[PDB]
Amino acid sequence: MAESQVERFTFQAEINQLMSLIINTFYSNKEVFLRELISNASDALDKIRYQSLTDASVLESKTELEIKIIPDKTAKTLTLIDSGIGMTKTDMVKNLGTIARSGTKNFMEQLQSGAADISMIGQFGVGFYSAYLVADTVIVHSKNNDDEQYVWESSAGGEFTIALDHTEPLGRGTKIVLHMKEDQLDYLDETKIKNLVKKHSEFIQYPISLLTIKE
Ligand SMILES: Nc1ncnc2c1ncn2[C@@H]1O[C@H](COP(=O)(O)OP(=O)(O)O)[C@@H](O)[C@H]1O
Ligand SMILES: [Mg+2]
Structure with a gap:
């Protein structure tokens, strides 16, 4: 028997509204999700x-600075792994949903007005949530030098764990895992994702490994 303590949190009100808007509205071009992941x-x-x-010692936990992208058609997932700073548990609570961002309301207003489109989400400090354009559930595993490894999970609906x-x-x-919506599985096609990665990584100064998994 495995045992686990899970803490449940509620999204900040405006963040909840935005997620609802991202999920329950048709958007023609959803490519921005990948630009935001890589960014x-x-x-x-x-x-x-x-x-x-x-402080040279901070790299001892993992020497390589790199990005891995794994489309997995069988699992219906897209995974992005980076060996960046990572997030502590409190970092995840604060940065992934409980704290208000000043851009949130203004972005929603600009989306409604036509002043902005969905591709501009990153400019408003809420780029992370673009994952819900293509994914029903997002899972974020993270390890920061200061804490143990934690996993954040949300399928929206106003809560995360x-x-x-x-x-x-x-x-x-x-390691961010996107569980892809049935209508967005095209983003897992080898040549499509290869192309999109090349397109959205022109100025990225770290190596990218694209790993296509077949069963
Ligand atoms: N791969 C990652 N590694 C570390 N922290 C991350 C990662 N992805 C997201 N975060 C945290 O979540 C926050 C929200 O990201 P985002 O919504 O794109 O806003 P921004 O990039 O403008 O800060 C980031 O500022 C960062 O603190
Ligand atoms: Mg960002």
Whole structure:
């Protein structure tokens, strides 16, 4: 018998509204989700890299600074792994849903007005939630040097959970798993995802490994 303590949290009200808007509205082009995933990974990698300039020991948990992308058609998942800074449990609580972001309301208003489209979500400090354009459930595993490995999970509906993660140790960094919506499984096609990764990684200064899994 396995035992696990799970803590349940409620999304900040405006973040809840945004997630509802992202999930319950048709958007023609949803490619932004991948740009946001890679962007976040690159930012996380920059953070640990600059920390290592002033403190070399911070890299001992995992020497390589890299991104891995794994489309898994059988599992119906897209996974992105980075060896960036990672998030502590409290980092996840704060950054992944409970704290208000000042861009949230203004983004929603601009979406409704036509002043902004969904592709601009990253400019408003809420890029993470673009994952729900293509995924029903998002799982975020993370390991920061300061904490144990934790896993954040949400299928929206106003709540998320966080628990200690006893799955494969990351060493350091973040593994985000998108459980893809049936109508968005095209994003797992080998050539399509290859192309999109190349397109959305032109300025990314870390190696990217694209691993196509077949069963
Ligand atoms: N791969 C990751 N590694 C570390 N932290 C992350 C990662 N992805 C997201 N985060 C955290 O979640 C926050 C929200 O990301 P996002 O909504 O894209 O806003 P922004 O990138 O503008 O900060 C980030 O600022 C970061 O603190
Ligand atoms: Mg971001």
